[PDB]
């Protein structure tokens, strides 16, 4: 890239995501990666982990425009990932989700615009597509915020777009680390609905998606990566095989209310989108979900799993 | 009632709604009805229309807590109707919709709580059920706000609940005044989808719904009125007959994107609700919509229409 | 003009005034007219009335600088008309009048200055000349605000000036629509003081005044249009004659406290002003009022009245 | 009094006024006098001057509600004197005058109300009667603010009223210290208009006025003290005589724009007022001015002057 | 206790400290422990760790008074531990340290006072005693904030006090986990200054200190626990012995600038303090440091170390 | 200079300091000196004292960014002296000291940066070196604020540095005016500790120090002037001799807690500083104090004293 000599700021950068971005990009021609957040602890661990003079750490938060403006000054590109992203916590403190997810984004955009930042990519979730919960509601509203802003601001000034992705394999919310635990534990693997589906997205896929929008999105665009899926039963089988393990699979029936599949595009959006090859693009103005994609055989699932670092490390140590 | 000697504040009260509330209640035992809003013009017209010493008018807005606190002081009950409620305007200015619909409600609740207001009823829309647009998104988030607040505040202190209703017949967004215009004009009546459906709700029904929640809702409850529906074709036929008119009905096909039906309860909510007789109640935690209610014959539609003042006035004058 | 290819923003634009400005200018070489205000309803009616792609509508208010900044971006000229302008409403909510009329103007100026807007014209009232009521007090303070700002900011940067005018014939506060009603009603016309006087200003005159300041005012200037006046008795006579009507004039004596005349310039200001031909100009630092101007015969009053659209429409329909 | 065991807060208390209040009241049964302002220097001098454990000093300002709330906690009565009171400074920084004089008062009232303060007396000026300048405009608007608040708040809760007085003899703006200087200097005394008039008010009179409102005003009342006046020529003569001095009086003609007389009540207010004996009272809803009061002979002027401490000290030392 | 049926809020509760408090108190008669902070992740882990219905988690931060007020409502006692506590991060973002450590505390106090919270204990650091760095400076200023507030607020209302402690053994900043790592690693243990000293404080000691202030501090008090110390050389020897390990100790000389000892009380404070038995108390108005306490033999150090859970777990596993 | 045609703003300019700056610079080639503060009284006296069209006065305060921005517009250099500088007042209202000394400076820097001001010099105190009191604590934190800002902002943009000086001879806190009073009074001179020491700094020295930083400091630098000192006993002797007076010196012993000496540089800072000739410079990252400088004989003290205007005026008049 492309990032040659530029300065990238990542809000919410002390995450899984920020970390993936740093691995892939730190040793590039990029001039700096700034990590903007409130947690001095995590920032310190990350500092000590990379010992890199291009990692710059800024204390502040997206609800605090002052603290944003300091982080933003001289920045070329922003990946905007800060958010209150857990369902119960948005459901109990929706004002907090509003201040962080929605007003927080507004703050980021305004600050980037004022600093003449070239591009902002706002990360969103599959849960913004059929907003059912407070986290998802806040996220859908966040997308209306950047989409609205993008109309009023020339592209050549600041380009503003976003992405959606869902479950990341082996991340916090992934069932993979729970399954592998249970294998190592000599425990049964508990499935509720074995045909419940997720798109298959690793951490690198997600970073590749934001990079794609970074390169190719028009202002106002929502960008989504084409991805196969798999049932969770097929995934539990793929893992047992990988680990040459024989732990009882205990199928227990639907926990009444769980997400059956992941919707990345609604009927409405899919009807409007551009097929770009490996990505769909929804320009600023049946459904694309994990049940109606290419669903993977146990064997192909094994192949995907094996491109996962977290999975390779578990497999050696075992 | 029940409102005997009490003080009711209505935000967004310079509306259709506020006006209905005043007609029904002004000549009661209520001590005052305060009308809280920014528009001095409308407040003045309403003042001159009723010439009633119990109508008190307060200048301010829900984004301005100071101005709320003044209106709130000594208030018993609040019907919280202020909102930015039009689709394009929320879609172009979603921050504004956030500040008004979501933070604005937070302001109202906080102020009412501090003033020891007994009850707040937050009006919502059918569009909060499957939030697809920015107005609907803001509204669904508003409901998460009151529902969250209601958990943290004792009922005996302030009770906090809300209602949903959809299209009101012969109101601003109703197709009735457009149809009647076209009759009087000697014009065709243009239908896009003749089987598109709306619940049948007059203005008095809506006021009766808020009154019901006022009397019977628990804190955290969303309350919805059971109502028949009708197709728009059947409605265009009922009107032509009422007016003994013979204007060509021009059926033109779906305008690609229009709301086909009204959803008052989602699969999820309907699954959780209590049937109360004439109302469903969703307690703080397939679908109820206008296609799967009692749908009305042309003849029953005529009967409903005739309970409408706006319709009776048009019918005499013609 | 002159407005060729420029972008004009009008706060308080959903008014009588904004509407006059749009009629006169929409079909010109102007690139856009933006209408900035909180009321989505009115904005929507105006949208539907003109069906013009150059009318741009912005939701926000002058107390909210964020929402101003969005409206202001890339704007060439501002006519600043937003205000809380009714006497009782300023008298009961003077803080609200302060926030809107005075701080609101400060917000507008600051935002325009930051956006490099070329010119701001702040509309004021005859009531700022001898501020007796809260509305008038707020308005006089508003003029001190723009006048002060204009000293600190180079003209070539942003020019800042204002206008005063009083009663507009046939507008909301005009006695003309009440008189014409009474004619059509077969009712008496009630006068309190028949020699009470108003300057004679139509809506087009007012728009012409702002246009004049727009073209010719120096920064810090207050601009006022020279206008004849008439007693209200003479005006009631002119109307009866126009309508060839014979309704009893009931003269009832002064309502104790009413405005006897309109003061556009104080002794002090008139002593400082420049006579410009058709306008007086008060540069940033006996009286000019409706009793000591050219007062009109019944016959000349008829001629003025007839240049009024509102009057021409009433006269045909009758 | 009456102030027995109570706590009085004085904003703007580091003044002439605050000092007069402290002299008269410190050695009483009052429990504390709190002096609220931003200037640590003056507060320190006053501390060192009285060495009194009942003088409590609070740092903050009326624009800062936090800092007010701290000063207000447990307070019984407030004399609200903080203000930006000089003409050029309000004329150049009217926003500052607005924030201090008008919003600042709002802050004070709100804070006092919340703390259950029994009484607030807001000091105003003769210049609020025919507001011609920015200071006077801000002051008239301040009176609308307390008058409005007083309507909404029960008397038994917080009583809110104000006073007006004009020139205080021998204070900062008084011509007395300039005349006496000129006497001691062997210089001429320069008069512009010898018949220009001021009410005759000493510092003790002013404190007596606020005390009167404190005791007898209803909420919403403006209170004014009846006072004789004198021309300035008569005053220059009275002083020369007192000092048995023979300095040339140089009469130089009106400086074009100077205040000729002091208006304490407008035609409008005087028409509404209650004569209370030694005070007029304007209840919340020709003129009383220094030309139409009892005007004093040179001999009576000498008698008034001699009740002045500042005058007695000059007279001994000379 | 004592905490029987009460509600305790802990800001900064997702820490080492908050965790210690929960272990010791969760299984008591306490009615709730609320954990107030911005990090949903940590709050979620802690939720899953204790599975206790008395742990309540609140999202918000101390810079956000709204979010505090929600957490504070009905609270009996507060342990105020939220802070930006790392040296470089305060040194690079001192405004952030100010907003969090100083204004943040002000917010907490104000909110607790308004909610009638009985007691607030503000945790401070040894580094507030001779503030040399930005973190220490912010902390000393924090103590002036609570000490000032405590003067103005009756004890019986809200009692406000604080504590200081320094290094906690085996916590984040402790050298113990680095030494034990090096043992297990077969690595040398690197000492810079072997006679550099720390007070010996475990996590339980710290919790016992706050509990002590909770029970016995007067309002305005700073409370400090009496504790022995040890050199780091003696500590490295005690560990090697415990682990029956023989790793080379590499003494490397002072890193030029490191903290040689810990000062809990200055000359000034120690001169003012009350010796309470096991604690010193500094009432609201040579030095006590780790060099001039009871310094421990290698053998006594071993005994202290062994009362440490972190040390016992390492010792078994090895 | 150097100040030729430039515009200098002085916050806290109504002081001793601001006055010294005006004397030295008003009659230069400087284009304007703006004096920014809240006190209209002092600003008015200063206006009347110099009658200079280059003195511009701005009303506002450093806590109010709006009011700063107005003062800052087009400014070349800022000497930032506004502060709450007295010990008891910071000790009783530390929040106020925080808002003024620390956030206030942040405001100033931000505003200057945005206005492209070339240089800001922040005045600090010797008391920031071993912050023991709330005023000193606030001041040390202020230095961390400018030092942090200076790292993030290019020098060529805005240079940001500060100075420290201690007691100014014959200023408010100087013992000189108390001694001279006592001489003229025929009173004893009371000393507590005769060997207590202060650096010897006149008002001109201080202004020369800020000027030096103005010319030569790098961004982030703290600058301090090399100065001799004297004991207070030696100073009391020098004065008695100057005045050829024989008043009893009453030595009374240390008031337990008084400042024995002045520390301008800590061990730490002195270890880092650059000796510049007449100044030390601490670049952005045993002790220098009044006991270990060149201490002056009674005779040299007399010579210093005589370069003091305040001393020369007392000496003539006596
Ligand atoms: N003869 C007259 O002076 C006269 C005539 C007519 C009316 N009045 C009215 O009576 C009052 C004047 O009393 P005075 O003559 O003693 O006035 P003064 O000498 O100007 O004192 C007024 C005080 O206001 C304080 N102040 C200014 N802004 C403030 C803020 N934001 N917060 C807190 N304190 C503030 C100042 O204290 P710090 O600098 O310590 O903050 C000052 O000592 C004014 O309200 C005025 O309208 C006076
Ligand atoms: N040995 C020591 O650590 C030590 C030594 C001396 C003094 N102290 C004092 O004791 C306290 C430390 O306890 P600890 O060691 O457990 O600290 P910790 O591990 O840093 O935890 C402190 C907590 O503060 C929370 N926090 C930070 N900023 C916040 C804000 N604006 N609002 C709400 N919460 C916030 C964090 O929670 P979230 O990330 O979830 O918001 C964090 O878990 C500090 O106040 C410190 O001054 C500690």
Numbering used by the authors:
A (entry chain A), B (entry chain A), C (entry chain A), D (entry chain A), E (entry chain A), F (entry chain A): 0 to 284, 305 to 337
Copy text verbatim from the article accompanying this structure deposition:
The transformation of UDP-D-GlcNAc in UDP-L-FucNAc requires three enzymes (CapE, CapF and CapG) in S. aureus. The two reactions catalysed by CapE are the C-4/C-6 dehydration and the C-5 epimerization of the UDP–sugar. CapE consists of three well-defined regions: a Rossmann domain for binding the coenzyme NADPH, a substrate binding domain, and a 23-residue loop peripheral to the protein core. Herein we present the first crystal structure of CapE, revealing that this enzyme forms a stable and functional homo-hexamer.
Two structures correspond to the binary complex of the enzyme with coenzyme (wild-type protein and inactive mutein K126E). The level of NADPH bound to CapE was essentially constant among all muteins as estimated from the ratio Abs260/Abs280. Firstly, individual residues of the active site and substrate-binding pocket were mutated: Asp125, Lys126, Met134 and Glu257 were changed to Ala (Lys126 was also mutated to Glu and its crystal structure discussed above). The muteins K126A, K126E and E257A where completely inactive, demonstrating the importance of these residues for the functional binding of the substrate. The structure of K126E with coenzyme bound was chosen over the equivalent structure of wild-type CapE because of the better resolution achieved with the mutated protein. The latch is not observed in the two crystal structures of CapE with coenzyme bound because of dynamic disorder. The coenzyme engages in a dense network of non-covalent interactions with the enzyme, including polar and van der Waals forces, and hydrophobic interactions. The A–B and A–C surface areas of CapE in complex with coenzyme are significantly smaller than that of CapE with substrate analogue bound. The reason is the dynamic disorder occurring at these two contact regions. We note that all the muteins eluted as hexamers during their final step of purification by SEC.
